[PDB]
Amino acid sequence: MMPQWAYMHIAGQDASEYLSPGLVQFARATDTYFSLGNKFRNPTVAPTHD
Amino acid sequence: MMPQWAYMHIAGQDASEYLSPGLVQFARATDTYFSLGNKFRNPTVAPTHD
Amino acid sequence: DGASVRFDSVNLYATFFPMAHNTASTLEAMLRNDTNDQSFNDYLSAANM
């Protein structure tokens, strides 16, 4: 509800970090029969200052 | 049935697991000149009950 | 130039992985939880004017 840019996954954590660990295990274990990977946003922010 | 299948490498261990580790090291170390990889079976069993 | 079309019927087809009933139920319980919302971009996203 509260975060905005990180809630819509435009910035911050990876799917490997925001999803509950039970689901991350389940994905890795089933990824060749039924792949969930295309269903979660991974943000990719550019480097800014240096 | 299983020792027959584990002995003819239809099920069980990978070549990286049944071969003596000296041969596994030798293989990796010479694999760009003279490649021993195609000479050993790797089984690939499917997930069964769940 | 006289072209025409008529539609006799529309049907929706869907295909399910025949996943073990307790495995699928385990996957469901994980996906109903707010940490695990699915999310997607317009795949070549812009405001078109």
């Binding site: 295990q25 389940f26 990977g37 991974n42 | 769940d50 | -």
Partner: peptide, 16 residues
Amino acid sequence: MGTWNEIGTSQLNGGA
């Protein structure tokens, strides 16, 4: 513009 980035392991059914 999209960001597919995942990997998998040995032939298990799912979680432990």
